[PDB]
Design a binder for this molecule. Structure first.
Ligand SMILES: CSc1ccccc1OC(=O)N1CCC[C@H](C(N)=O)C1
Ligand SMILES: [Zn+2]
Length: 139
């Protein structure tokens, strides 16, 4: 679980969005596993606008943060799950690091701010949904 709170927006994994997120929907993209909903309170986070390929992510299944080197956002095949059929997920960045399904929503940050959230993983890999291209999050 986990979200990014920026301005009057909440960014969550689309597969974990709640009834309230869908009732206050701003934008969603199943191909990216992202959903953004509106909030009444001003958010705590800031978004990186950079090309960093290293950073630190939070891993809830270890209660720890880990440093990672990750690939640039790209189209990657993701096997079927209870949430989606087998498909290509876009704007996904892979890295070597521990993750389990419940880790989705953990933030990845570089020295410039929030880069993205955990969205996929497996066998010593962890994948992050990039948010750096969503310029409208802090217009
Ligand atoms: C950190 S997720 C994870 C980690 C290890 C093993 C499996 C994991 O589950 C995934 O890769 N899934 C399940 C939830 C939806 C994901 C998606 N974005 O399509 C794909
Ligand atoms: Zn950066």
């Amino acid at each position: 679980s986990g979200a990014i709170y920026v301005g009057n927006y909440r960014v969550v994994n689309r597969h974990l969005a709640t009834h309230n997120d869908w009732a206050n929907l701003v934008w969603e993209d199943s191909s990216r596993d992202l959903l953004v909903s509106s909030t009444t309170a001003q958010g705590c986070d800031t978004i990186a606008r950079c090309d960093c390929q290293t950073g630190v992510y939070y891993c809830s299944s270890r209660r720890k943060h880990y440093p990672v080197s990750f690939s640039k956002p790209s189209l990657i095949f993701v096997e079927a799950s209870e949430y989606y059929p087998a498909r290509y997920q876009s704007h996904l960045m892979l890295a070597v690091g521990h993750s389990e399904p419940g880790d989705c929503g953990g933030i990845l940050r570089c020295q410039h701010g929030v880069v993205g959230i955990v969205s996929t993983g497996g066998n010593g890999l962890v994948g992050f949904a990039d948010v750096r291209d969503l310029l409208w999050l802090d217009e």
